[PDB]
Design a protein around this nucleic acid. Structure first.
Ligand code: MG
Ligand code: MG
Ligand code: MG
Ligand code: MG
Ligand code: MG
Ligand code: MG
Ligand code: MG
Ligand code: MG
Ligand code: MG
Ligand code: MG
Ligand code: MG
Ligand code: MG
Ligand code: MG
Ligand code: MG
Ligand code: MG
Ligand code: MG
Ligand code: MG
Ligand code: MG
Ligand code: MG
Ligand code: MG
Ligand code: MG
Ligand code: MG
Ligand code: MG
Ligand code: MG
Ligand code: MG
Ligand code: MG
Ligand code: MG
Ligand code: MG
Ligand code: MG
Ligand code: MG
Ligand code: MG
Ligand code: MG
Ligand code: MG
Ligand code: MG
Ligand code: MG
Ligand code: MG
Ligand code: MG
Ligand code: MG
Ligand code: MG
Ligand code: MG
Ligand code: MG
Ligand code: MG
Ligand code: MG
Ligand code: MG
Ligand code: MG
Ligand code: ZN
Lengths: 220, 59, 74, 95
RNA sequence: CUCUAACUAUAAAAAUCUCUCUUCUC
RNA sequence: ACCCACUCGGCACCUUACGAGAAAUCAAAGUCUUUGGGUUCUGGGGGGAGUAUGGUCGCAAGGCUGAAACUUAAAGGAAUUGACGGAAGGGCACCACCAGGAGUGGAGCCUGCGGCUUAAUUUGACCAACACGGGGAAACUCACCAGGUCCAGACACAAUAAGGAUUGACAGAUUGAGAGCUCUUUCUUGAUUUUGUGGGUGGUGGUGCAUGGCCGUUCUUAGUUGGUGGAGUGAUUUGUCUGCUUAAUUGCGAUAACGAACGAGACCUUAACCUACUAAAUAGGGUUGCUGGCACUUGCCGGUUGACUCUUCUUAGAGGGACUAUCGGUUUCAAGCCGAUGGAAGUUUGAGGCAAUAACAGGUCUGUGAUGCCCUUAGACGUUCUGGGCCGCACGCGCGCUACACUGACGGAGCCAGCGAGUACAACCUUGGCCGAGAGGUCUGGGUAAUCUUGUGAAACUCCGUCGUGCUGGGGAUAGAGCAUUGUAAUUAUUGCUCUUCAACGAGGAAUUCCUAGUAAGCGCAAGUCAUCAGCUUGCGUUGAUUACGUCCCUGCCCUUUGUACACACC
RNA sequence: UUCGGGUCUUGUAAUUGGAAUGAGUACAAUGUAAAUACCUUAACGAGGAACAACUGGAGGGCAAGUCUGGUGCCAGCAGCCG
């Protein structure tokens, strides 16, 4: 297709120049991503799935002005997820901006082992949880090949994550899909927020990619 | 949307299409598609923006 | 809105005037004079020319081609 | 001006004696039947009726107590009924 | 880098309302 | 007794989320899915119901304890956007008011509705229906009614059928008809047709609550919208606002907002002003001719398509001109407001034309050969012809017209416009000359138009007289008779004209309409309807004011704040 | 070069052929106290292989129709919303 993508951000400039090679450099230094094309460049195979389309109305003096809320989940099934939620007039535009936000909000996850480690991680590392609205989602590690014991939306989120086995437990009005998916997103992104004995030793604080490669930014 | 895209591809400074009628429903409704900017008052409405009205027969 | 009822007619019927077809109609117009000369039973019309036969109904003869202008009392 | 509809194979005429609440009516059907009449479809809040109104009502052969009122006549088609005389003429209902 | 001043002052009456609600998918 | 510092304990308070909550919010409502400091009481959808019963306390009132049968898909909490408020703040509007003007509502009539009536009195609208559908219909229109015609039923197939599928008709009965519509008789005509099936057309037939288009209205107000960004879990919100200013979401600005888009403005038409340009026998003027008259001084008022010359007015092109220009006040001194002067013009210069998002179940199938569906499609709801109706009349209502008189009516005389329009394959605008009292008639001549009607010599108005407060010379409705015009046709009076009867009407209750400057109002003319007909509408001009130059009191509109048990939204 | 052989395969057609087999009957024998029945097995036993698979549902919850005809807030459907 037609895509130029003049970079307007220093991170975008560095990515376009090809100086950042892996998204782990973006996640490590907590860099702010504002151009979705960076995420497209780093993860070429981000599949999606429109979880829900919801008509939301505003009562004005003349009729009821209706928009559509799209809940899009993006990921590569290899430990990267994003959850975009958008509201727009036309449904197609809603889905486009929703996937756009979802790509902007990609996040890494820490898959672990239920018991002994034999192959690649199959489940999460520890128990995690999140809460959005009144919906609290609790993800619990499960033994190998136990499947994803979760509601269909959360199940699709985990499948997009790459987590193959996990137990779940949701409390509240899990009816509302946006709240449930946001809570699950909080939990699965919190998986990398839990200090674990295998994560205790300190590191050397490698300099930020925009410090070592500041010259290639700042379009002159 | 294809018509609007082609028109704006032609160099037009704005296109707009109203499709009114029984769009896949018994009750009438009008859909509005637009891009760019369309003026509405003063002979600029006659000097620049050109309009066309047509009827389409369905089953 | 309009509220129309079934029309009711105070007339029995008027029927299409069926043309009175006549089998062997042409031969009655002529007369064979015994294997040779032939004559015509009806009268010839002057305005149209030879051949066209007058119509005799009662005390007059009437034409068919210039029918309107020829009706001459017998 | 609309054509007046006659009864047929079960439906019969009547007169409202007193109108109850909740879409209910007491109707005297002209067989000596002080029956209960239910306001029915096409008749809920589209045409209004009152006390002492000529009425047409369909019976229910599985219960003769209650019966379902179908069509109301506008005090002029009632006059036409009155002259043709399908209903008893021993009753005076005027304005 | 020093600071507490101006002001009023209106109450009459008004009860009730028969429909009908209609899809968002690139 | 204060002042400074500290500490213990108490009622409290401000900021914040880095914690918690469905949120409003909480420094506890935190340390709760990373769930366990001790402990008591209470709740398991709403209603029935804190009811009955049984205890128990009380003099009594009533307290404590306290269900079920049954019924129900919700009841409820917090918040968001609207709508509403006889809630608040700030601004607006003569479809609001104040100060007024002219009125309507009282009377006649004309027209449009309702109702009644009728064979039919065809129908759609009930601020935003009612002189509206261009709806001033005698025929047509037409859609209604009583009747009479025809197929303008393509096409395919079958069927008859060229020893006749069929068509048409003189004359008579019949008919309203000179209709071969139907019959009496017969004659004519040739494969186009006729009778059955499928199908198709036609329909002012139904459904604007199936639709398009258009228009109207919400809403003449200034209001809408999305892209990155911020706040919210969220519906949503900020941008779109505390102020001041504006006709304006118009600007000055302040700012989790920055840039933008539509609307407003800008923009076009029109009305001005152009002794500046270009010019003009289809517009005007001067000088001079050739004349007329009067004056007698060389001058006045005229006529001529004779000449020369000019463009001030009349035209229409390119342009100019006003941008609140200068000055004075007032303004966080900024946006802007007020005043004076110069100006043609200083209300956005006046008046308009387009005119946003969203919407109405607003109207229109009756404008469309726009149209989906339904109905009908042969004695038709198709089409045409004749006649009637759309106009009836015990009655209510809505636009108006003429009036109730002296600022007048009636006679004479004066004599003043601007928009228009106008004939060809038809017959229009009509001058002028003769007739008639008039309407009108006739004979000629111009004009396919700055040329001719036309300077549309219009009315109101002005001057001089008659009338004289008397329903009178006001008012001219209702009728009688006659004369003409258009029309195939005028009765149920088309319309005009002549003579007569001359009715109600004494400035019109409650109530209610429109309008702030060449405006209202008075007065007419042109154009659209038009063969003839306006009391209608759209435009134009004549005479031309009183009273405001403000307000939120009534009716509403815009923004903000607040409350809501409303969202089919205070009907 | 349009093709197009179908070069390589996979379905749809009341076309069309040859196989295999029971569910049934049934010599036997086994079985059983005696018999059924099962396991084995002679001889028969499939062409529309009529030797014929129903029960519910097709708006959502919840997989699957905004196909045709009928009824028009009736008849009825619907566990709830409808
Ligand atoms: Mg604009
Ligand atoms: Mg404008
Ligand atoms: Mg009921
Ligand atoms: Mg309970
Ligand atoms: Mg209670
Ligand atoms: Mg007791
Ligand atoms: Mg509440
Ligand atoms: Mg008013
Ligand atoms: Mg007043
Ligand atoms: Mg008047
Ligand atoms: Mg009156
Ligand atoms: Mg009156
Ligand atoms: Mg009428
Ligand atoms: Mg209005
Ligand atoms: Mg007339
Ligand atoms: Mg006629
Ligand atoms: Mg007529
Ligand atoms: Mg007829
Ligand atoms: Mg028609
Ligand atoms: Mg017709
Ligand atoms: Mg409508
Ligand atoms: Mg508007
Ligand atoms: Mg945003
Ligand atoms: Mg907003
Ligand atoms: Mg000049
Ligand atoms: Mg100044
Ligand atoms: Mg203006
Ligand atoms: Mg309607
Ligand atoms: Mg039609
Ligand atoms: Mg009429
Ligand atoms: Mg009117
Ligand atoms: Mg006079
Ligand atoms: Mg003039
Ligand atoms: Mg005059
Ligand atoms: Mg008099
Ligand atoms: Mg008089
Ligand atoms: Mg007058
Ligand atoms: Mg009219
Ligand atoms: Mg004012
Ligand atoms: Mg509600
Ligand atoms: Mg009320
Ligand atoms: Mg079945
Ligand atoms: Mg079923
Ligand atoms: Mg079914
Ligand atoms: Mg499904
Ligand atoms: Zn002849």
């Amino acid at each position: 297709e037609e895509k130029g993508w003049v970079p307007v951000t220093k991170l975008g400039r560095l990515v376009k120049a090809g100086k950042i090679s892996s998204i782990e450099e973006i996640f490590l230094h907590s860099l702010p991503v504002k151009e979705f094309q960076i995420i497209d460049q780093l993860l070429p195979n981000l599949k999606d799935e429109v979880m829900n389309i919801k008509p939301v109305q505003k009562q004005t003096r003349a009729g009821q002005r209706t928009r559509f809320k799209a809940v899009v989940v993006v990921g590569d099934s290899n430990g990267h997820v994003g959850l975009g939620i958008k509201t727009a007039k036309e449904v197609a535009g809603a889905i486009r901006a929703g996937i756009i936000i979802a790509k902007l909000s990609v996040i890494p996850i820490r898959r672990g082992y239920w018991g002994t480690n034999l192959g690649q991680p199959h489940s999460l590392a520890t128990k995690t949880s999140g809460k959005c609205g009144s919906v609290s989602v609790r993800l619990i590690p499960a033994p190998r090949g136990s499947g994803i014991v979760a509601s269909p939306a959360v199940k699709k989120l985990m499948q997009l994550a790459g987590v193959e086995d996990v137990y779940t437990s949701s409390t509240g009005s899990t009816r509302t899909l946006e709240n449930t998916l946001k809570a699950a997103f909080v939990a699965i992104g919190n998986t990398y927020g839990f200090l674990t004995p295998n994560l205790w030793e300190v590191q050397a604080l490698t300099p930020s990619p925009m410090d070592v490669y500041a010259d290639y930014a700042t379009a002159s | 949307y294809g018509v609007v895209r082609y028109v704006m591809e032609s160099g037009a400074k704005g296109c707009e299409v109203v499709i009114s009628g029984k769009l896949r429903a018994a009750r009438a409704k009008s859909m509005k598609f637009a891009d760019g900017f369309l003026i509405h008052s003063g002979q600029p409405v006659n000097d620049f923006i050109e309009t066309a009205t047509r009827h389409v027969l369905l089953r | 809105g309009k509220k129309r009822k079934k029309k009711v007619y105070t007339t029995p019927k008027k029927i299409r005037h069926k043309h009175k077809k006549v089998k062997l109609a042409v031969l009655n117009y002529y007369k064979v004079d015994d294997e040779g000369k032939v004559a015509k039973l009806r009268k010839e019309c002057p305005n149209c020319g030879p051949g066209i036969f007058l119509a005799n109904h009662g005390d007059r003869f009437y034409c068919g081609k210039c029918h309107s202008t020829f009706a001459t009392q017998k | 001006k609309r054509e007046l509809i006659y009864k047929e194979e079960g439906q019969e005429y009547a007169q409202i004696t007193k109108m109850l609440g909740n879409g209910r009516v007491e109707a005297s059907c002209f067989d000596g039947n002080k029956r209960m009449a239910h306001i029915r479809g096409k008749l809920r809040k589209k045409v209004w009726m009152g006390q002492g109104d000529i009425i047409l009502v369909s019976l229910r052969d599985f219960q003769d107590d209650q019966c379902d009122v179908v069509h109301k006549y506008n005090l002029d088609e009632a006059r036409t009924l009155k002259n043709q005389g399908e209903l008893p003429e021993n009753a005076k209902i005027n304005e």
